Design a protein around this ligand. Sequence first.
Ligand SMILES: Nc1ncnc2c1ncn2[C@@H]1O[C@H](COP(=O)(O)O)[C@@H](O)[C@H]1O
Ligand SMILES: Nc1ncnc2c1ncn2[C@@H]1O[C@H](COP(=O)(O)O)[C@@H](O)[C@H]1O
Ligand SMILES: Nc1ncnc2c1ncn2[C@@H]1O[C@H](COP(=O)(O)O)[C@@H](O)[C@H]1O
Ligand SMILES: Nc1ncnc2c1ncn2[C@@H]1O[C@H](COP(=O)(O)O)[C@@H](O)[C@H]1O
Ligand SMILES: O=C[C@H](O)[C@H](O)[C@H](O)COP(=O)(O)O
Ligand SMILES: O=C[C@H](O)[C@H](O)[C@H](O)COP(=O)(O)O
Ligand SMILES: O=C[C@H](O)[C@H](O)[C@H](O)COP(=O)(O)O
Ligand SMILES: O=C[C@H](O)[C@H](O)[C@H](O)COP(=O)(O)O
Ligand SMILES: O=C([O-])C(=O)[O-]
Ligand SMILES: O=C([O-])C(=O)[O-]
Ligand SMILES: [Mg+2]
Ligand SMILES: [Mg+2]
Ligand SMILES: [Mg+2]
Ligand SMILES: [Mg+2]
Lengths: 471, 471, 471, 471
Amino acid sequence: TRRGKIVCTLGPATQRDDLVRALVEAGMDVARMNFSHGDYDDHKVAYERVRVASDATGRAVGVLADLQGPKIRLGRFASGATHWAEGETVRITVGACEGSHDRVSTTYKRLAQDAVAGDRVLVDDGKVALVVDAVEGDDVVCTVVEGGPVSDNKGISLPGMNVTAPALSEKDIEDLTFALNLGVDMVALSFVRSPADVELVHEVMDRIGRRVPVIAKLEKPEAIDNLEAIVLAFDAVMVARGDLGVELPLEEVPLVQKRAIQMARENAKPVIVATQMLDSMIENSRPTRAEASDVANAVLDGADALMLSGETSVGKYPLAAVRTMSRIICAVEENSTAAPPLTHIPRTKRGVISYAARDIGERLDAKALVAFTQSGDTVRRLARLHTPLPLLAFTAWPEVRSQLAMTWGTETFIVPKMQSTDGMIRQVDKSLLELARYKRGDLVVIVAGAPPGTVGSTNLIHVHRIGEDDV
Amino acid sequence: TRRGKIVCTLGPATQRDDLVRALVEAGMDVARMNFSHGDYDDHKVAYERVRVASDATGRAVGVLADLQGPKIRLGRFASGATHWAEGETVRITVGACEGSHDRVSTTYKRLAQDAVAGDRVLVDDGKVALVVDAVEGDDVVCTVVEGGPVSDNKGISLPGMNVTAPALSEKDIEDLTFALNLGVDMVALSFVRSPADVELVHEVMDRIGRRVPVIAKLEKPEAIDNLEAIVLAFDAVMVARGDLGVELPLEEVPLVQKRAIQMARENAKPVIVATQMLDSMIENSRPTRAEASDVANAVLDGADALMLSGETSVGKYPLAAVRTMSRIICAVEENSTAAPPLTHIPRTKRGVISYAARDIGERLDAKALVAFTQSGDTVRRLARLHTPLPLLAFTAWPEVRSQLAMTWGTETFIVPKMQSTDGMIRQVDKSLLELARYKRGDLVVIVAGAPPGTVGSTNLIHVHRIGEDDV
Amino acid sequence: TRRGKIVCTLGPATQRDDLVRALVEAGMDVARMNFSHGDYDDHKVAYERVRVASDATGRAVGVLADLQGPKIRLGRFASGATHWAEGETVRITVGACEGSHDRVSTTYKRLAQDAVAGDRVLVDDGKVALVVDAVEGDDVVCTVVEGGPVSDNKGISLPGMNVTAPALSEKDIEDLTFALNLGVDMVALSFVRSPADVELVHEVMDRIGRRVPVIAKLEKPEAIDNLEAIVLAFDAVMVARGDLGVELPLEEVPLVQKRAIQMARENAKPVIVATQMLDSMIENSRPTRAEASDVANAVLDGADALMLSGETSVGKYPLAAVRTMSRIICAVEENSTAAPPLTHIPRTKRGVISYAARDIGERLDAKALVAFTQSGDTVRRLARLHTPLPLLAFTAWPEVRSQLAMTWGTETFIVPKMQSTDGMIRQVDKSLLELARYKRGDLVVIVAGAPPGTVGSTNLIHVHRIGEDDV
Amino acid sequence: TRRGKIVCTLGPATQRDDLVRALVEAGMDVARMNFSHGDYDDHKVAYERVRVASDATGRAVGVLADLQGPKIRLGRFASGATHWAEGETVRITVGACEGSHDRVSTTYKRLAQDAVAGDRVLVDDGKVALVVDAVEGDDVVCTVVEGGPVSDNKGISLPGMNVTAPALSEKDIEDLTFALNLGVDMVALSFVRSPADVELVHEVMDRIGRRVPVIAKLEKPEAIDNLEAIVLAFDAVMVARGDLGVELPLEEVPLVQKRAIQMARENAKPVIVATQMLDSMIENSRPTRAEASDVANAVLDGADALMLSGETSVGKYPLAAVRTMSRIICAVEENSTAAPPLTHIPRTKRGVISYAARDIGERLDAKALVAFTQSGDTVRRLARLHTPLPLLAFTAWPEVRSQLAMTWGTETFIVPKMQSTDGMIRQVDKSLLELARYKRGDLVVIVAGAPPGTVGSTNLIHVHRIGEDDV
Ligand SMILES: Nc1ncnc2c1ncn2[C@@H]1O[C@H](COP(=O)(O)O)[C@@H](O)[C@H]1O
Ligand SMILES: Nc1ncnc2c1ncn2[C@@H]1O[C@H](COP(=O)(O)O)[C@@H](O)[C@H]1O
Ligand SMILES: Nc1ncnc2c1ncn2[C@@H]1O[C@H](COP(=O)(O)O)[C@@H](O)[C@H]1O
Ligand SMILES: Nc1ncnc2c1ncn2[C@@H]1O[C@H](COP(=O)(O)O)[C@@H](O)[C@H]1O
Ligand SMILES: O=C[C@H](O)[C@H](O)[C@H](O)COP(=O)(O)O
Ligand SMILES: O=C[C@H](O)[C@H](O)[C@H](O)COP(=O)(O)O
Ligand SMILES: O=C[C@H](O)[C@H](O)[C@H](O)COP(=O)(O)O
Ligand SMILES: O=C[C@H](O)[C@H](O)[C@H](O)COP(=O)(O)O
Ligand SMILES: O=C([O-])C(=O)[O-]
Ligand SMILES: O=C([O-])C(=O)[O-]
Ligand SMILES: [Mg+2]
Ligand SMILES: [Mg+2]
Ligand SMILES: [Mg+2]
Ligand SMILES: [Mg+2]
């Protein structure tokens, strides 16, 4: 079975009866709730459907709350939608108005103040392109250079224009509050551009008295310029290639992806690769050769998880998309699970020990690597190494099973909080012997710590045969 | 400037006035003439337009004749086109008939004899899918399992069904004859499945008294099963991912590509990667993030050349497609031109010397590597290594400049046939000093042979400063 | 302090009052009792003096019983000693007789029937050389080719002559019996030439109901031809360079040494390098530059132990010899303790775990590696790796401390037989805290097993801070 | 045949009738004339005997003039010799006197001024050792701590005492003058301690209008402290282990040797390893196991040349010593000629090209590497690499054949000064075809330059079959 994790986005196409169930059964490891779209009713109903499916199948499924961030958007049109034809003049104003074809508002109130002639405007992640002709008082006069359809509240991008906007919008803070109370397992922040952006997320979490892992979505030059600092301050990163591929030259993204995955793994942080991996499966039952390649290469790059956006959220083949993504990952890993080596020898106790654990497992042809983890840290230093051996995280904290759903190669087991290392090993034997696949005598390598239930306490490797008296 | 070579396919969208010129000016290195489509008038007019553009710009442009091979195709419909809806019964007969919705002919006259119930039928490279229910005398009854439109003479694929059909069809032999007389520089054969398939191509070439380099298109299991033998018998290979991705599981293609590129380079043969690299640019001015990734990864894989099929042949943005492909390749090579190392130390005189030549060039920060070549062999053993140094092929045979248009990193220079090594070096000085970019004193490494104008005679490396008395 | 172990040979020069004490205080790790020389009184008195010095200093000192083996020797001369002058004819007979200058006996009674004209005879490890002229019935007439003095019972070598003689002589069996009852810790067998030679040693040990580790002395072509098999059947090996350098071309010995050390370490067996390492210190207070080099190079070769023969046994500077050898080893190890890498990844549980233990220790800058061992095996798989970290063997079997005296880099600690892993760790804390060098908080890596007091049970690594509650 | 070069020292034992001839015939590559001993008659007669033997055998033999340097020596004794017994008081004065047992002069006039109580005095390279008790006006009162015999003008060492003495003594300048006029090929300077010491040697050479290569003898801490600068300013280095092993701790010498050989080879300079390699062969026909080891290890260290001092100069077996040294080197090289890799990629034109030349040779199983050289530089960058292929230097300067006698693996060929590269290749064919060993067709790799007869002009590699038309 598969090692690389699959993130799916919920929306209209995953609202049909028991479709969230179908996704989980097909291999969805993480469910992305995109707070750009939908009502709190829609989110609640979706989150419910995931918990049921997770608990009914016994498949771990993390729930990821994606916060819109300071996204810039067009206003409302009198018509709901217009057609912007190559050669037409369009005014985009910071003034209040009901838009029409040639004059519409935007959410960014600093547009008049920050946009200068020659500035480019990409709509809907690149399809309709304008150039700024003039800024007259409150209006921004543009010429459509690539033509197409625009609708109410369609998103835009002003590449290289310096955008002043709080890391968390007032709407994001309410979405974050709603999501923390609802019981989501992780939070993703759009348009991160500083390591300090996590402090503001944390501030809100502390008010509400609930912290979850915070994913930095990489889709801004400032993010890549500060990749290292951000990967260290945040708990995971997403290569958000849609916005990244308009905010940077689209031809720069491939190497930024590769460099960001390598940075994540060096620091034992989850990395998701996102957006258009199987874009064509929105309309078609099979993907393009490019798409198949893109997914295979994300695996060999060393990505913890690949994500589907529109493929599952609004697509015609959300199921086929997940199944297809699964087959491709499996095809690659059958050949080899190998990842690009780390460019540093581990220095932290948990890194050194997890590295050693992998070594002993592989060299002794063990049936499993088992790590005990309170925060998931010890497990994440073993995942990044990419062994072909099963990696089994043992934890007393159910949320950590949901958190590790986006960590490479990792199945998690909830067990009572133990007061001894011998107890942890009895737990392993107990848990593992329930599965047909493990038998008494089978050799496994166990990583553990003392004093138990203490983070960073991990200090022990035990080569154990299941059920034998070797403790 | 760019090292990786770009192959474009000519068709309706590259027939508009001076568009073939625009392609060459935008960076087209090889022009594919696809003999699946078009009249001999259409091909002649296109081939003319390429020679003019090549000669008018002084950009080398190879002309590649792609032979349809034993492609299986549907017959004619009374309507020209029908709609095959998920759930419908369709008869495909080896009998002669004008088709309608529920009964149509195919070109494969062995279909009744070779198709068994449960066999799958993919149309138009996968979009419409049938399953074989029954073979009733001459008719093959199928159920549409994925629905869509079919037209006259649309191509089909019977994956894993053993197809008996000659390597060269009677139509291919006439297309090959036409193409050799027209003056094409290389020939590509569809659906190669044995190393001996090249003997039949050669046979025809010998009758006509004209041999060109023969590209094996890899798009059949038998091809990959015999990859090594084929790469040795043929002069180049194309990873033809369209048909390969229906004839094999589409999830297997990514690693077959990688393994086929590595096999090409080990044996100093050109490899093209083909089909759907920028598929979405048929309709759109920018590609998908998957597409951008697919192209970048073909470069890092070590592909001599990337190809555009429908992107240039029938697409709306043939120019943007070439420009976009060029930017992506350039983005990757700016970072590094490095390729996956070879798994063998060179053993052949030309391999050893070209390897050594690269070493001396790079270590001495030379301005250029220069190799003299009659067949292009000596040059191709340097190309596969992927140095960031300019690689300048010197030849007396104009066709060889067109042949090396699909070899990595290589610009070619036509010079008189020399009778001495000192003559070859004077030639270099003269040719190079015409370009602004080279000046007297500039350090350059020259590979040459004696007796001159003899293939495999290469036996000499000379570290030369341009215009200085060091011979 | 020093990692490489020093073996000293006892004889006349180490019989002086307190000399054996002085040797131990100067760094003697193993005391060789050479059963070629001395009577049982001399051996007893020497063995007593070693146990006292070991127990009085608390320095581990192994006692090695070196068995003469089937050594070929000259008979008795009427004069005790004669002079064999270059050019003289000498008869060496298998017949019984009192030795005249020109006619003497030998112990080898197969000489007449095994010696053919042209055969060479080296005396006293090479200094006087003869050639065989004629074999007359029972006499072997030779011509002195290199001249010098010979005495009663002087040893000879017939290089390349096939010698039929039991692996254990009648006198060896009595020396072995005497040595096992006396309480020696290891046994060395001279002139091993088959892996089965250890079976005959074991046979005697089983009769007497006492087994000790058996060292194969390598000093015969048959030994080197069977190096691997011998290293696997025996518990250690000695490169016995004196006899090896007359039985083989002396110019072959340097690489045989290197290849025999590498073979020992691959299979986790002790290797001693022996004979003439500091030969000139028999007469002189400082060695030759060659001698200094020879010792340094034995260290970099990866030798567990270097031996002194005549330097301590009959020499004028037994003390200086040990001190000097110690300074040289220390000089080398100060720079680096690094050894030639192993040509195989460990496959045995104990190899894999000890390798991993080293890794964790070095990477975490631990103060010590600690291994619990019943047979010393687990410790010996860590020793061969040559870490700069102190290596501390913990055992309940006092003999094992004496056995590990000849294992690289290893100090041993006797502790009560423990019934738990937590017990072993409390033991470590207690033993180590007695030494000034270790304090509470100091980081150490502990290797252990369960069920305890079982050989090959080793299955556990524990990163422990001394005195802290982390078990 | 052998690659590593053998330096022999001439003296009383090489004055017997055509003994110098016997040495050359046995493999002496360089003859050391030690100007510490002998008068100019003795040197002339010896130098004559070497030129005759070299010319009569056609074996290249370099002649090395070793200059005594600022060696500190005892004065004359009334008796010619006394015995200094452990426990005796000895006065060593800077005042003029005919010595006796209690009171003797020295050459060092700064002894009273520079020697303080507690200072150690080694005599005759270590055998008799004193400690300084008091300095009374002009006298240095010492206690014999190690006893033995001393004679007229015996050499002493004051380790760690700062010695003020010119790099060239007045006696050295006259020996250097005599040696340059006599026609010696190289000059060795004792007790180098600064890179500028070569400037003073050069100064004298320039006055006399003759420069030869200057060997820095390494035997002082200041030398090792400045190893790199010295190796760059001087043309070769000798590890002079006799004095180095009293001026430094003798236990430090082994690693200084290794580090000095590595430094020589990195900068393409010859390194000789000197003194006591086979010390025991002064008295004995076979060496010690240490001695055999010392020679083998000098080879694997990467030494261009091993030297014999007393073994040939005063020894009883000068011939056996050379033969024995030869067998050991040959034994090692049979197994492998491999040297410790260089820690830098070559950067100079001649380094890069010679590296490349080796590559092409080895990979194509060439019969020889051939390099054309004016100064020997191009050859010396190939030698340091240690290929198992024959290395044949071609030069028009006969002295360069004598100079390359101490460069690893190198046979030299004198040829007319050529005006073309094609000429150099004709020369090779001609010279090589005279030897039975080379035949027409045999492939060889040739390194050359233009304009010819210019140092550092080397810029060409040619893969040539002997006698074939491939130029
Ligand atoms: N079920 C458990 N009971 C007690 N401690 C646990 C349990 N599961 C994991 N741990 C602890 O998780 C710690 C490692 O935490 P971390 O450094 O966050 O991986 C180890 O010290 C384990 O003792
Ligand atoms: N312009 C030329 N005139 C004469 N020989 C050439 C010329 N160009 C290339 N060659 C020869 O091509 C040979 C190498 O051919 P190949 O083995 O096909 O690379 C070398 O011997 C070159 O000298
Ligand atoms: N003091 C001890 N008490 C109980 N077992 C010990 C003790 N010392 C060493 N051992 C055992 O030595 C075994 C290692 O055996 P070996 O494979 O011979 O190294 C470990 O499994 C330890 O349990
Ligand atoms: N016999 C020769 N006649 C002319 N030039 C030579 C001859 N031998 C060597 N050389 C040149 O000496 C230069 C090499 O000098 P070096 O850099 O000192 O080795 C090259 O240009 C060689 O071609
Ligand atoms: O947050 C801290 C970082 O993750 C570590 O400092 C870094 O990851 C080093 O980890 P290791 O030494 O375990 O690779
Ligand atoms: O056609 C022959 C193949 O190309 C060679 O056998 C292969 O290329 C190996 O040659 P090299 O030693 O130049 O890599
Ligand atoms: O006596 C047996 C040998 O020592 C082992 O079988 C061999 O040494 C393999 O051990 P490792 O895999 O631990 O090096
Ligand atoms: O005297 C100069 C030195 O030999 C060079 O600078 C040094 O040897 C580097 O040369 P290569 O780069 O050829 O090793
Ligand atoms: O021929 C092709 O290009 C294919 O099959 O993709
Ligand atoms: O000069 C020498 O040869 C020495 O000191 O060993
Ligand atoms: Mg986004
Ligand atoms: Mg095809
Ligand atoms: Mg012996
Ligand atoms: Mg000296």
